[PDB]
């Protein structure tokens, strides 16, 4: 039954543009991480919230990593076909509302099921759940985040699908404050059609089975993680002197 229309010339170009955009904005060697404020891991085997908030030992490093990542995501977004056709206001609304979700998606590349960490170098740049608690977050965010990373890993996405998913995540017409939802939807549909077509024509079985719907579900999971992250960030920001441990960009995007 299922027809397999071939990718159009345009669709092939969209894929190539997104792959190039990602390769220019995601360094798989994590060579810039030593430039961030250093990671510090206080002794907290008991997971004390009082101690974690008192020290926020991993916050400067993780805030720098997230801030750096937001800058890369802004650059990636600017290369998404159609993104620059949007008004500046809609572009900023889309970037601010998707930032954390795209960070969670793109981070899957360093996440490894070998030990359930984001491995970005030697021990210094190996990030574990215990590091996230040392940055002021709790299990309500961490648990679903790790579950999401593993679920995404097991989809065994082609790089083409991974970059398309990030682009679709950014160009979402259902974000609060967007003006031209119709144009945003048109841009997203062009990307979704490219993704659906790619899966049916280039993704071998059995990993291709209902893969599109699995990818769409991950976009829904991301909305939930976004909301929880926002709630936790708000509370984290109540800690006196927290602003110094963050960055101006992080403060704007999540404040
Ligand atoms: C960033 C990237 C990477 C890892 C992501 C991680 C591991 C550390 C903790 C992070 C950054 C989680 C955060 C929710 C931690 C809290 C952030 C904050 C303090 C601002 O509220 C989400 C994704 C997680 C590394 C590399 O893949 C580039 C990528 O781009």
From Swiss-Prot:
One of its GO terms (cellular component) is RNA polymerase II transcription regulator complex. Ubiquitinated by UBR5, leading to its degradation: UBR5 specifically recognizes and binds ligand-bound VDR when it is not associated with coactivators (NCOAs). In presence of NCOAs, the UBR5-degron is not accessible, preventing its ubiquitination and degradation. Residues 10-255 form the NR LBD domain. Residues 78-96 are annotated as: Interaction with coactivator LXXLL motif. It is linked to Rickets vitamin D-dependent 2A: A disorder of vitamin D metabolism resulting in severe rickets, hypocalcemia and secondary hyperparathyroidism. Most patients have total alopecia in addition to rickets. Nuclear receptor for calcitriol, the active form of vitamin D3 which mediates the action of this vitamin on cells. Enters the nucleus upon vitamin D3 binding where it forms heterodimers with the retinoid X receptor/RXR. The VDR-RXR heterodimers bind to specific response elements on DNA and activate the transcription of vitamin D3-responsive target genes. Plays a central role in calcium homeostasis. Also functions as a receptor for the secondary bile acid lithocholic acid (LCA) and its metabolites. Belongs to the nuclear hormone receptor family. NR1 subfamily. Composed of three domains: a modulating N-terminal domain, a DNA-binding domain and a C-terminal ligand-binding domain. The 9aaTAD motif is a transactivation domain present in a large number of yeast and animal transcription factors. This is Vitamin D3 receptor. It comes from Homo sapiens (Human). The gene is VDR. The chain holds residues 118 to 423 of 427 of the full protein.
